Amino acid sequence: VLSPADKTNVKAAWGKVGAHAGEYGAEALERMFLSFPTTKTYFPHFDLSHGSAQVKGHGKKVADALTNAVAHVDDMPNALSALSDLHAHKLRVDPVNFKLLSHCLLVTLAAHLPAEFTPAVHASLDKFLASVSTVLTSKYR
Amino acid sequence: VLSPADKTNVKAAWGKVGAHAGEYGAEALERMFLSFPTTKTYFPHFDLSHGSAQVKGHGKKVADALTNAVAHVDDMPNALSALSDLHAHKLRVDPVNFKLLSHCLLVTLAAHLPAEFTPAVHASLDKFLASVSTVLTSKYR
Amino acid sequence: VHLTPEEKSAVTALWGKVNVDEVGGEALGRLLVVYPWTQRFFESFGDLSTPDAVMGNPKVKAHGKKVLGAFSDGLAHLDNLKGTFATLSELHCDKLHVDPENFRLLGNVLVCVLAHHFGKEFTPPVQAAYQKVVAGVANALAHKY
Amino acid sequence: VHLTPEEKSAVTALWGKVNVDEVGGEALGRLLVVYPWTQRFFESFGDLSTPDAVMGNPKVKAHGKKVLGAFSDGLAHLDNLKGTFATLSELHCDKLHVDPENFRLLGNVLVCVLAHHFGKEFTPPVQAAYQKVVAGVANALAHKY
Ligand code: HEM
Ligand code: HEM
Numbered sequence: 193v194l195s196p197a198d199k200t201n202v203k204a205a206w207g208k209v210g211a212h213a214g215e216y217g218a219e220a221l222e223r224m225f226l227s228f229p230t231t232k233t234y235f236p237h238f239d240l241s242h243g244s245a246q247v248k249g250h251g252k253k254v255a256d257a258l259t260n261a262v263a264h265v266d267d268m269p270n271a272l273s274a275l276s277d278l279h280a281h282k283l284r285v286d287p288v289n290f291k292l293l294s295h296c297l298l299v300t301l302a303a304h305l306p307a308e309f310t311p312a313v314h315a316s317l318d319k320f321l322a323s324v325s326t327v328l329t330s331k332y333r
Numbered sequence: 334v335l336s337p338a339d340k341t342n343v344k345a346a347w348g349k350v351g352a353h354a355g356e357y358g359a360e361a362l363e364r365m366f367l368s369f370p371t372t373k374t375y376f377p378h379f380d381l382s383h384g385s386a387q388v389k390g391h392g393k394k395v396a397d398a399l400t401n402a403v404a405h406v407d408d409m410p411n412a413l414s415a416l417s418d419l420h421a422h423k424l425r426v427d428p429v430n431f432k433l434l435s436h437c438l439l440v441t442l443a444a445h446l447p448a449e450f451t452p453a454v455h456a457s458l459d460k461f462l463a464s465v466s467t468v469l470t471s472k473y474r
Numbered sequence: 475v476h477l478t479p480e481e482k483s484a485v486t487a488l489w490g491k492v493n494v495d496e497v498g499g500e501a502l503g504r505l506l507v508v509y510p511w512t513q514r515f516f517e518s519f520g521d522l523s524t525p526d527a528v529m530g531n532p533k534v535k536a537h538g539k540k541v542l543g544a545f546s547d548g549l550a551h552l553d554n555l556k557g558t559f560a561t562l563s564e565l566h567c568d569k570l571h572v573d574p575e576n577f578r579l580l581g582n583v584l585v586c587v588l589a590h591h592f593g594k595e596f597t598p599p600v601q602a603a604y605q606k607v608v609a610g611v612a613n614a615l616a617h618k619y
Numbered sequence: 620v621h622l623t624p625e626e627k628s629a630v631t632a633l634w635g636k637v638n639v640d641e642v643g644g645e646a647l648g649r650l651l652v653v654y655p656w657t658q659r660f661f662e663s664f665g666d667l668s669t670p671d672a673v674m675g676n677p678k679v680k681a682h683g684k685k686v687l688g689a690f691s692d693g694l695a696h697l698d699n700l701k702g703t704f705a706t707l708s709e710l711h712c713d714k715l716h717v718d719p720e721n722f723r724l725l726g727n728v729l730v731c732v733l734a735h736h737f738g739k740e741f742t743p744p745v746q747a748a749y750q751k752v753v754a755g756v757a758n759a760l761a762h763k764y
């Protein structure tokens with residue numbers, strides 16, 4: 193449960209991401225594939241090579257959805273219904289994986305938003321990614 | 334979320350537990366202590382010996398709370414608020430341990446309810462224990 | 475794994491009583507039923523729409539027997555699981571693209587199945603030895619990823 | 620751990636640029652803030668009521684330095700983290716009652732602090748190697764439980 197402070201923290205941090213969200217999207221995936229090689233089992237049809245357009249494009253896709261989620265921080269369940277659906281009934285990614293992408297995304301933001309990645313912002317973002325994870329895995333069963 | 338089916342399943346299997354809940358609670362703890370030794374770090378003040386009265390006493394408490402969650406299956410967040418507060422603020426049990434107890438609870442029921450422990454019931458009990466765990470950990474941060 | 479001699483005997487003693495054909499189908503069907511997401515690898519198996527559809531599906535049953543067969547062999551090479559499972563690890567990774575977490579879920583399901591089947595005989599400490607075993611197998615199976 | 624000579628160099632060289640003092644205080648503080656339940660072991664430290672209060676607490680800072688110190692010394696025994704942390708493993712279990720999961724949480728926090736610090740320099744491949752190390756350390760510390 194995101195507090196008012198959290199929502200603020202998140203909106204601020206993401207605010208700064210701006211035009212780079214797509215790139216950060218791509219970079220987190222790349223960090224994910226290398227750090228947790230088991231996550232590659234869900235992308236057998238992609239070229240997982242560095243700077244692959246498939247990864248880049250997918251990075252964008254993920255970033256936009258996070259953007260949309262920040263925008264509807266108050267109504268996530270509703271803003272991500274379609275995506276919860278897709279993952280629960282089509283993709284069927286194992287829930288453990290969500291924590292791996294989340295971590296890689298924090299690492300990415302840390303590396304790129306030094307001044308903004310304060311302990312309190314770090315805490316907020318974590319809870320945020322956890323929340324998003326929960327929503328995306330709520331219709332699994 | 335628990336479907337009507339799930340609810341019937343849970344009330345049904347738990348129904349069979351009846352007056353053995355206490356003993357089954359104690360047994361789940363013991364299996365957990367033996368299979369997942371790291372959970373012992375939370376009970377440094379307990380005699381964890383075979384047939385410890387402390388374990389016995391603790392098993393009853395856990396069993397009583399589960400029984401209370403079954404009795405209020407449509408209002409768990411409220412029926413369990415107190416316990417949610419305790420765990421979040423005083424015990425501060427790492428979240429991952431809930432999954433370990435759940436699993437040892439499933440094992441105990443299986444070992445005692447051969448006839449009711451059907452695939453469908455197994456599934457329902459798993460989602461149920463996951464829900465209780467979610468509630469007890471909801472106020473952590 | 476770190477199996478005390480007496481944990482190794484207890485595993486082996488109980489395993490002697492197991493009908494791998496039967497337990498095999500039970501474990502696999504149950505997996506597909508409790509964690510429906512795991513169904514993603516079996517779209518060619520047909521109807522998996524309800525519990526009965528899964529539990530009774532001839533293909534699930536046959537597959538389960540295969541998996542448990544390979545598992546039973548692992549039990550005779552408890553000293554070298556990594557070696558025992560190497561080609562299987564490569565296959566699951568490179569060919570099948572099966573997330574190794576699936577291997578731990580199956581392990582847990584299997585432990586419930588043994589409890590189901592053996593009742594009181596599946597003592598706390600027998601469970602503890604099997605927990606070590608299923609973890610070792612899952613680990614061995616994920617080693618080539 | 621199962622570090623490639625190349626992965627070994629990458630760890631080795633970034634570390635050489637680390638101010639243990641600051642990184643240790645920040646890693647431990649971030650832990651107490653992101654995962655508030657870890658504060659159950661530091662009651663005697665004082666005011667942990669706020670990020671500001673945690674980050675400023677000198678008891679936290681000095682404990683952070685002690686922890687990273689020991690971590691630091693373990694990178695010199697990357698081929699035997701197990702024998703390097705055996706005594707520390709027993710202490711944490713038998714005296715401190717610290718759940719090893721805490722070891723994993725810090726590991727991850729540590730990685731965020733390094734990224735925070737080295738920006739550009741902390742590349743995907745450098746993170747992969749660090750991830751292997753934090754996992755390795757956590758595993759070694761949990762070993763005697
Ligand atoms: C941070 C949480 C996540 C978000 C917001 C997210 C969002 C998305 C989005 C926006 C898409 C594209 C939908 C479309 O094509 O219209 C997608 C697809 C996909 N996601 Fe998720 N995702 C998340 C976590 C994960 C994780 C952890 C994995 C696997 C390890 C994953 C695996 C996939 C796959 C395999 C696809 C389809 C890729 C393709 O074939 O193009 N996702 N996700
Ligand atoms: C869904 C699962 C759980 C339930 C229903 C549950 C319920 C309870 C209850 C009813 C109590 C007693 C509170 C009182 O004194 O009134 C308790 C205490 C406690 N629980 Fe939980 N709990 C659960 C999970 C866990 C887990 C996973 C752990 C750690 C592995 C844990 C550790 C503790 C400890 C250390 C205490 C205090 C015991 C004492 O000192 O007497 N609990 N729990």
Ligand code: HEM
Binds near residue numbers: 572
């Ligand atoms: C105890 C762990 C496991 C063992 C020992 C095992 C063993 C096997 C064996 C011997 C085969 C046949 C190999 C071949 O076709 O040459 C197989 C195939 C397969 N396994 Fe595994 N398996 C295990 C767990 C799993 C799990 C948990 C899943 C998915 C949830 C899975 C998914 C598959 C699939 C999709 C196939 C191919 C089926 C086909 O013929 O189309 N396995 N496994």
Ligand code: HEM
Binds near residue numbers: 725
């Ligand atoms: C990188 C992993 C860790 C390492 C290498 C490590 C190392 C140390 C060392 C060297 C000490 C000194 C105490 C003595 O020698 O008597 C210590 C104490 C302690 N550690 Fe760990 N530690 C680690 C992780 C943790 C974590 C994650 C926690 C809890 C969140 C923790 C809780 C404690 C506590 C409570 C003490 C006792 C402090 C005191 O006596 O006031 N440690 N640790």
